[PDB]
Design a protein around this ligand. Sequence first.
Ligand SMILES: [Zn+2]
Ligand SMILES: [Zn+2]
Lengths: 12, 12, 177, 177
Amino acid sequence: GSVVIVGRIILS
Amino acid sequence: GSVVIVGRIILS
Amino acid sequence: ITAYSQQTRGLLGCIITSLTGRDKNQVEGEVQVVSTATQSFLATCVNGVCWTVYHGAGSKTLAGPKGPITQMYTNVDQDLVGWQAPPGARSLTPCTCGSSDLYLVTRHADVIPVRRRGDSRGSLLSPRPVSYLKGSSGGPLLCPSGHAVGIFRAAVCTRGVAKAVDFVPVESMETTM
Amino acid sequence: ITAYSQQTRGLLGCIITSLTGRDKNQVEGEVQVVSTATQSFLATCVNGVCWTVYHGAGSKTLAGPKGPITQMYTNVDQDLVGWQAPPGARSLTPCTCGSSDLYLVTRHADVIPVRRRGDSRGSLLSPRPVSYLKGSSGGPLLCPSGHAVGIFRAAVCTRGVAKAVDFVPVESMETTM
Ligand SMILES: [Zn+2]
Ligand SMILES: [Zn+2]
């Protein structure tokens, strides 16, 4: 099974 | 997205 | 000293109970097997507070009877967080013993000997694979009589062999309050 | 130089999206929180390519807008792999400005300070416990201007505490491009 993006991390 | 208790370890 | 696990929720349960944050399940025992969308770790109630490791919990709320329980104490720099214990919640008592003889309890109820090697360090009498301790951060480091001396953080390992543990002492937990 | 987490999916989401390999989800950010069925970590999008640790990823595919993507770069020894970034995904711009003052973004958006202590090392200012870093491999280390310098590869731990880190120099990501 694949690797999945479950979230993000917004920089500034 | 909350932390859910899915079980426990009974001490003795 | 022996412990035994008990599963209280399946897939559908964690997912719905995690969405809403509404867990009308009655809490029992002193250590809770908790999970998020990614990992699955452990939690220990010591003197009224459901404690756990911050890497696992982040800053998430615990699923509670009244709804989402925003967490109370938070020492991120010690990788620690805890929530105010839910109704019932059988807490543990701090050390008293001085005893350097600890035991680590895993997410499968493994009472495994550790020797108080420092303020937070601790030796494992017989090394095991690091897969053995997977999903146990948040667990307890007890004393001979069963008191909560520390909340287990991670194994100290080299070459896939884990021979030591790194925990937060019950005493710095209290210092947090 | 702040950063905040954001979940885009729950377990049911990782599960169905890892099975079908298809991800209709909009890519936004720079650092992505990614997961397999046995661990979770981060991925930093640099120069139009998604970089992450081979230790977390392995040879696995990345769920994409049109189906699963094959790694286009893989270096098992330098523990780094990459998939062409799916069209419409933000990407960090490299550093090379000599700054020794680096900041790494963890899985919870904690911008923790590190001093470059070598070519792929960086002294950790506030020696956090190692457990603290767990699940943050794959994430970036930026130079004061917010440009990329490498990918947090692992932790240089001294029996408990992590007083420094190992990362893939952005230069070793380019010799492989
Ligand atoms: Zn005691
Ligand atoms: Zn720079």
